Design an enzyme around this catalytic site. Structure first.
Site, PDB file in Angstrom:
ATOM      1  N   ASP A  25       0.790  -1.237   0.000  1.00  0.00           N
ATOM      2  CA  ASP A  25       0.000   0.000   0.000  1.00  0.00           C
ATOM      3  C   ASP A  25       0.812   1.272   0.000  1.00  0.00           C
ATOM      4  O   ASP A  25       0.342   2.325  -0.418  1.00  0.00           O
ATOM      5  CB  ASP A  25      -0.906   0.034   1.214  1.00  0.00           C
ATOM      6  N   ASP A  59      16.312  -6.963  17.726  1.00  0.00           N
ATOM      7  CA  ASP A  59      15.483  -7.088  18.916  1.00  0.00           C
ATOM      8  C   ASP A  59      14.009  -6.994  18.535  1.00  0.00           C
ATOM      9  O   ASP A  59      13.216  -7.774  18.989  1.00  0.00           O
ATOM     10  CB  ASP A  59      15.838  -6.024  19.966  1.00  0.00           C
ATOM     11  N   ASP A  76      -7.682 -11.263  10.689  1.00  0.00           N
ATOM     12  CA  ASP A  76      -9.091 -11.515  10.406  1.00  0.00           C
ATOM     13  C   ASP A  76      -9.657 -10.785   9.196  1.00  0.00           C
ATOM     14  O   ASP A  76     -10.822 -10.393   9.203  1.00  0.00           O
ATOM     15  CB  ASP A  76      -9.933 -11.180  11.643  1.00  0.00           C
ATOM     16  N   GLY A  77      -8.860 -10.606   8.151  1.00  0.00           N
ATOM     17  CA  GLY A  77      -9.328  -9.842   7.009  1.00  0.00           C
ATOM     18  C   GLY A  77      -9.545  -8.382   7.376  1.00  0.00           C
ATOM     19  O   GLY A  77      -9.177  -7.961   8.450  1.00  0.00           O
ATOM     20  N   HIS A  84      -0.610  -6.801  16.029  1.00  0.00           N
ATOM     21  CA  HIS A  84      -0.325  -7.222  17.379  1.00  0.00           C
ATOM     22  C   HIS A  84       1.184  -7.314  17.627  1.00  0.00           C
ATOM     23  O   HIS A  84       1.977  -7.413  16.694  1.00  0.00           O
ATOM     24  CB  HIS A  84      -1.075  -8.518  17.743  1.00  0.00           C
ATOM     25  N   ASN A  91      13.816 -13.712  21.763  1.00  0.00           N
ATOM     26  CA  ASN A  91      13.140 -14.308  20.604  1.00  0.00           C
ATOM     27  C   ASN A  91      11.989 -13.476  20.037  1.00  0.00           C
ATOM     28  O   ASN A  91      12.236 -12.492  19.374  1.00  0.00           O
ATOM     29  CB  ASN A  91      12.780 -15.801  20.824  1.00  0.00           C
ATOM     30  N   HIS A  97       3.521  -7.411  14.482  1.00  0.00           N
ATOM     31  CA  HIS A  97       2.933  -7.905  13.245  1.00  0.00           C
ATOM     32  C   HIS A  97       1.768  -7.004  12.860  1.00  0.00           C
ATOM     33  O   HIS A  97       0.969  -6.600  13.715  1.00  0.00           O
ATOM     34  CB  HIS A  97       2.440  -9.344  13.429  1.00  0.00           C
ATOM     35  N   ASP A  99      -1.497  -6.356  10.115  1.00  0.00           N
ATOM     36  CA  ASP A  99      -2.407  -7.069   9.218  1.00  0.00           C
ATOM     37  C   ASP A  99      -2.441  -6.409   7.850  1.00  0.00           C
ATOM     38  O   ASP A  99      -2.895  -5.276   7.700  1.00  0.00           O
ATOM     39  CB  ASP A  99      -3.824  -7.121   9.803  1.00  0.00           C
ATOM     40  N   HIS A 119       1.329   2.702  18.731  1.00  0.00           N
ATOM     41  CA  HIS A 119       0.596   2.014  19.778  1.00  0.00           C
ATOM     42  C   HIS A 119       1.182   0.614  20.020  1.00  0.00           C
ATOM     43  O   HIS A 119       1.395   0.208  21.161  1.00  0.00           O
ATOM     44  CB  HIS A 119      -0.884   1.951  19.422  1.00  0.00           C
ATOM     45  N   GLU A 120       1.466  -0.106  18.942  1.00  0.00           N
ATOM     46  CA  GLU A 120       2.029  -1.460  19.027  1.00  0.00           C
ATOM     47  C   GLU A 120       3.408  -1.482  19.672  1.00  0.00           C
ATOM     48  O   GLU A 120       3.746  -2.432  20.367  1.00  0.00           O
ATOM     49  CB  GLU A 120       2.137  -2.091  17.636  1.00  0.00           C
ATOM     50  N   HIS A 123       3.446  -1.624  23.251  1.00  0.00           N
ATOM     51  CA  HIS A 123       3.363  -2.988  23.752  1.00  0.00           C
ATOM     52  C   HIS A 123       4.704  -3.683  23.752  1.00  0.00           C
ATOM     53  O   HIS A 123       5.008  -4.413  24.686  1.00  0.00           O
ATOM     54  CB  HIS A 123       2.401  -3.811  22.922  1.00  0.00           C
ATOM     55  N   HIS A 129      -2.809  -1.834  28.078  1.00  0.00           N
ATOM     56  CA  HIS A 129      -3.797  -0.829  27.705  1.00  0.00           C
ATOM     57  C   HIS A 129      -4.145   0.155  28.814  1.00  0.00           C
ATOM     58  O   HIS A 129      -4.287  -0.215  29.977  1.00  0.00           O
ATOM     59  CB  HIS A 129      -5.053  -1.492  27.161  1.00  0.00           C
TER      60      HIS A 129
HETATM   61  N1  LIG Z   1      -8.620  -5.805  18.376  1.00  0.00           N
HETATM   62  C1  LIG Z   1      -7.613  -6.419  18.936  1.00  0.00           C
HETATM   63  O1  LIG Z   1      -7.816  -7.450  19.573  1.00  0.00           O
HETATM   64  C2  LIG Z   1      -6.228  -5.872  18.796  1.00  0.00           C
HETATM   65  C3  LIG Z   1      -5.358  -6.321  19.957  1.00  0.00           C
HETATM   66  C4  LIG Z   1      -3.917  -5.989  19.721  1.00  0.00           C
HETATM   67  C5  LIG Z   1      -3.584  -4.647  20.302  1.00  0.00           C
HETATM   68  O2  LIG Z   1      -4.378  -4.092  21.111  1.00  0.00           O
HETATM   69  O3  LIG Z   1      -2.511  -4.063  20.003  1.00  0.00           O
HETATM   70  N2  LIG Z   1      -6.287  -4.423  18.747  1.00  0.00           N
HETATM   71  C6  LIG Z   1      -5.955  -3.725  17.534  1.00  0.00           C
HETATM   72  O4  LIG Z   1      -5.621  -4.368  16.560  1.00  0.00           O
HETATM   73  C7  LIG Z   1      -5.985  -2.209  17.481  1.00  0.00           C
HETATM   74  C8  LIG Z   1      -4.563  -1.792  17.777  1.00  0.00           C
HETATM   75  C9  LIG Z   1      -4.531  -0.304  18.021  1.00  0.00           C
HETATM   76  C10 LIG Z   1      -3.853   0.488  17.142  1.00  0.00           C
HETATM   77  C11 LIG Z   1      -3.784   1.967  17.344  1.00  0.00           C
HETATM   78  C12 LIG Z   1      -4.421   2.517  18.393  1.00  0.00           C
HETATM   79  C13 LIG Z   1      -4.349   4.013  18.582  1.00  0.00           C
HETATM   80  C14 LIG Z   1      -4.863   4.590  19.849  1.00  0.00           C
HETATM   81  C15 LIG Z   1      -4.802   5.947  20.050  1.00  0.00           C
HETATM   82  C16 LIG Z   1      -4.226   6.823  19.006  1.00  0.00           C
HETATM   83  C17 LIG Z   1      -4.152   8.285  19.286  1.00  0.00           C
HETATM   84  C18 LIG Z   1      -3.975   8.667  20.585  1.00  0.00           C
HETATM   85  C19 LIG Z   1      -3.867  10.116  20.918  1.00  0.00           C
HETATM   86  C20 LIG Z   1      -3.941  11.037  19.914  1.00  0.00           C
HETATM   87  C21 LIG Z   1      -4.122  10.611  18.492  1.00  0.00           C
HETATM   88  C22 LIG Z   1      -4.217   9.287  18.183  1.00  0.00           C
HETATM   89  C23 LIG Z   1      -3.736   6.303  17.841  1.00  0.00           C
HETATM   90  C24 LIG Z   1      -3.813   4.817  17.617  1.00  0.00           C
HETATM   91  C25 LIG Z   1      -5.159   1.663  19.362  1.00  0.00           C
HETATM   92  C26 LIG Z   1      -5.219   0.300  19.190  1.00  0.00           C
HETATM   93 CA   LIG Z   2      12.392 -10.058  19.467  1.00  0.00          CA
HETATM   94 CA   LIG Z   3      -7.894  -7.138  10.357  1.00  0.00          CA
HETATM   95 CA   LIG Z   4      -2.837  -3.977   2.250  1.00  0.00          CA
HETATM   96 ZN   LIG Z   5       1.349 -12.484  14.311  1.00  0.00          ZN
HETATM   97 ZN   LIG Z   6      -3.089  -2.574  22.039  1.00  0.00          ZN
END
Ligand SMILES: NC(=O)[C@H](CCC(=O)O)NC(=O)CCc1ccc(-c2ccc(-c3ccccc3)cc2)cc1
Ligand SMILES: [Ca+2]
Ligand SMILES: [Ca+2]
Ligand SMILES: [Ca+2]
Ligand SMILES: [Zn+2]
Ligand SMILES: [Zn+2]
Length: 169
Positions: A25, A59, A76-77, A84, A91, A97, A99, A119-120, A123, A129
């Site tokens: 993309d 790392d 999940d598409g 995640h 390791n 990763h 999607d 955000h990732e 983690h 969270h």
């Molecule tokens: N649905 C799920 O089970 C997974 C679990 C893995 C995970 O939680 O990592 N969640 C996701 O893929 C969404 C991952 C995610 C990506 C970005 C943000 C995200 C949150 C806040 C802001 C932001 C904060 C302050 C100001 C402007 C933007 C940007 C991105 C939150 C969750």
């Molecule tokens: Ca590693």
């Molecule tokens: Ca997805």
């Molecule tokens: Ca794509």
């Molecule tokens: Zn994975």
């Molecule tokens: Zn998260």
């Protein structure tokens, strides 16, 4: 904010990373720069350093995938899970990763790779969270139209509780 149980955390401050493959993309240059900008979010408020490796195992290994992609946590598409990341450790610790069924972008059209990566990486560095709706580590993807992303006070506090603040004078 919240840290991962056991307070899994990096003992070294000098971390390496590597992008193993790319999303169609965006251009490679554009993907590399998003991830770099995502790392800078965190290293600006800590003594952590992120260095790109040319090859081998870094790392923080970064990759894209769809559906079944090599671990036991399939994607999940389109929509739904965006990415995640594994908590700090050897390791696969730190690895992120993303999607590739999502349309990744550097703008507002699709999901913004930089914001998901930022955000990732929270983690990968040991943050869980946040219960605070203004937090980067809030669990709902959130877009912002700001040229100079400002890492929210909640995340700064969370990450500094693990690694202390950035340099002085
Ligand atoms: N649905 C799920 O089970 C997974 C679990 C893995 C995970 O939680 O990592 N969640 C996701 O893929 C969404 C991952 C995610 C990506 C970005 C943000 C995200 C949150 C806040 C802001 C932001 C904060 C302050 C100001 C402007 C933007 C940007 C991105 C939150 C969750
Ligand atoms: Ca590693
Ligand atoms: Ca997805
Ligand atoms: Ca794509
Ligand atoms: Zn994975
Ligand atoms: Zn998260």
């Amino acid at each position: 904010y919240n840290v991962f149980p056991r307070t899994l955390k990096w003992s070294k401050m000098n971390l390496t990373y590597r992008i193993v493959n790319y999303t169609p993309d965006m251009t490679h240059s554009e993907v590399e720069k998003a991830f770099k900008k995502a790392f800078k979010v965190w290293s600006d408020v800590t003594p952590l350093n992120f260095t790109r490796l040319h090859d081998g195992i870094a790392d923080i290994m970064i990759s894209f995938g769809i559906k079944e992609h090599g671990d036991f946590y399939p994607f999940d598409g389109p929509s739904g899970l965006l990415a995640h990341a594994f908590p700090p450790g050897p390791n696969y610790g730190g690895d992120a990763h993303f999607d590739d069924d999502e349309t990744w972008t550097s703008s507002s059209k699709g999901y913004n790779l930089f914001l998901v990566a930022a955000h990732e990486f929270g983690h990968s560095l040991g943050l869980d969270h946040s219960k605070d709706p203004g937090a980067l580590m809030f669990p709902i993807y959130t877009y912002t139209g700001k040229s100079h992303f400002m890492l929210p006070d909640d995340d700064v506090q969370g990450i500094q509780s693990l690694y202390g603040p950035g340099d002085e004078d």
